[PDB]
Amino acid sequence: SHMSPSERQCVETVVNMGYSYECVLRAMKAAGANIEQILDYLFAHGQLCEKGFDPLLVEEALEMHQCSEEKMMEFLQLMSKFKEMGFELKDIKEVLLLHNNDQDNALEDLMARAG
Amino acid sequence: SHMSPSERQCVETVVNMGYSYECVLRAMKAAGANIEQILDYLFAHGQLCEKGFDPLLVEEALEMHQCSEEKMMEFLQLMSKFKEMGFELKDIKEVLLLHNNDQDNALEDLMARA
Ligand SMILES: [K+]
Ligand SMILES: [K+]
Ligand SMILES: [K+]
Ligand SMILES: [K+]
Ligand code: NA
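Above: the input record for the complex with potassium ion. Below: its predicted structure, written as tokens.
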């Protein structure tokens, strides 16, 4: 197998917890071959989708903010807002990262390039 | 320029704090285009190299453990120790990650596969 021994151990254990292979493999690609990190990703991804967030934006938020749930949520909410205004995702990520999720600074930057 | 406006802003600001372009671009690639993130990476990388850690291993530790400075140090120390014992970096990273930096479990794993 192309997988390492630790990768296979993660898949075996998390699939035993009741997750599909596809979900586990995707989560492990994102979160790394550690069981708690995979489960935390799977649970957070599920909870956020259930709240109505776009799964693509959820995935961006989980990648961008691995350390703070509070910052992750702030990033997710503002990314959702700016995306619904019509800005491009690549620009939104960039300005939220530069400005530490400050809504006013991020918007000022996005507008300066809106067209 | 191939860089985004935010990337250019970071380079301009950080080079102004007296860092070389090459150091800033490398740090930005690792840490992302946010000035505090770049400065924190540059400073940590410097401090750990000054303590005598292999810069290649320092870079692996800064990548693996962005959230906990204590976890980052514990990983860096163990990766250095296991490398001295003669194990391969790729294996070492894998077992330290799986076993949450537990030395004995990681070691038993490494010896078992060797
Ligand atoms: K890997
Ligand atoms: K963070
Ligand atoms: K890593
Ligand atoms: K961490
Ligand atoms: Na990100």
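Notes for the reader.
The helical segments of chain A are 5-16, 21-31, 35-50, 55-64, 69-85, 89-98, 103-111.
The two ends of chain A are 49 Å apart (CA to CA).
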